[PDB]
Design a protein around this ligand. Structure first.
Ligand SMILES: [Ca+2]
Ligand SMILES: [Zn+2]
Ligand SMILES: [Zn+2]
Ligand SMILES: [Zn+2]
Ligand SMILES: [Zn+2]
Lengths: 65, 65
């Protein structure tokens, strides 16, 4: 839900605002991390994409006229 | 960042996947709450939009070939 993950070619693209992102390879190795978004060039194989959302609270002021 | 908030006419539209949304009026009253998104019809005045993201961790399996 609060992220997108997609693969095209060898490219894994991950988008998740205010989230810590991690990609693990099959050996459980952290091959990349980034906040918010990532474009990872992978090799053939299976990967685990981890999205850790930060769980903050935000407030916005809105004026209705 | 992990949400959008916009007022158009008397309509307040809020979008934030996996989040608890709240709108408070000027008296501090909860006038609406929803998961993930809402379309609120307001009266003239000032509103506080609160976005409480859930802070969960997600994992997706990705295959590169
Ligand atoms: Ca409350
Ligand atoms: Zn490691
Ligand atoms: Zn090593
Ligand atoms: Zn770790
Ligand atoms: Zn921080």
């Amino acid at each position: 839900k609060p992220y997108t993950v997609a693969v095209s070619g060898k490219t894994i693209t991950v988008e998740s605002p205010a989230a810590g992102l991690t990609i693990f390879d099959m050996n459980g190795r952290r091959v990349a991390t980034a906040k918010n978004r990532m474009v990872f060039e992978a090799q053939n194989g299976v990967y685990a994409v981890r999205i850790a959302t930060e769980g903050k609270t935000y407030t916005e002021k809105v004026i209705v006229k």
